[PDB]
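Dear V.,

Thank you for sending over the compound details. I've combined the ligand you provided, manganese (II) ion, with the protein sequence from our construct and run the structure prediction for the complex. I'm sharing the raw inputs here so there's no ambiguity about protonation or stereochemistry in the SMILES, which I know was a concern on your side last time.
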Amino acid sequence: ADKELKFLVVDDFSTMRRIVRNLLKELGFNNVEEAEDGVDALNKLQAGGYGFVISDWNMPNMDGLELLKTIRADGAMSALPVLMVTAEAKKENIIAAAQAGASGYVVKPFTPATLEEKLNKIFEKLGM
Ligand SMILES: [Mn+2]
Ligand SMILES: [N+]
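Below is the predicted structure of the protein with manganese (II) ion bound, written out as structure tokens.
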């Protein structure tokens, strides 16, 4: 994928965002910004420039599932890739994410290898 691809990393906890940001850097992606909930995320997304969202599940103000649905229903942002992160693979979460059109899911805690594989799966599928 293009190393200038701009990522938005969304989580209400700084430590989780820092993990993802560092992993993206290791993979060669330095164009990365952070958001602390779904509303903060949409505010950044609608300001423009983003090509990929990595979002947690549970957040105040607007949670990750709601963020995903809002993105998918948006007349402009509908196609934006969104990788959802879930604390544990409760089948209901995984199912809900799939139904709502998530690009992929990853269960935390996750290894660097797992995130890399998940991202590449999405890139390759989308011809990125
Ligand atoms: Mn959370
Ligand atoms: N939700």
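A first observation: Residues 1-128 form a domain with the Rossmann fold fold (CATH 3.40.50.2300).

Warm regards,
I. M.
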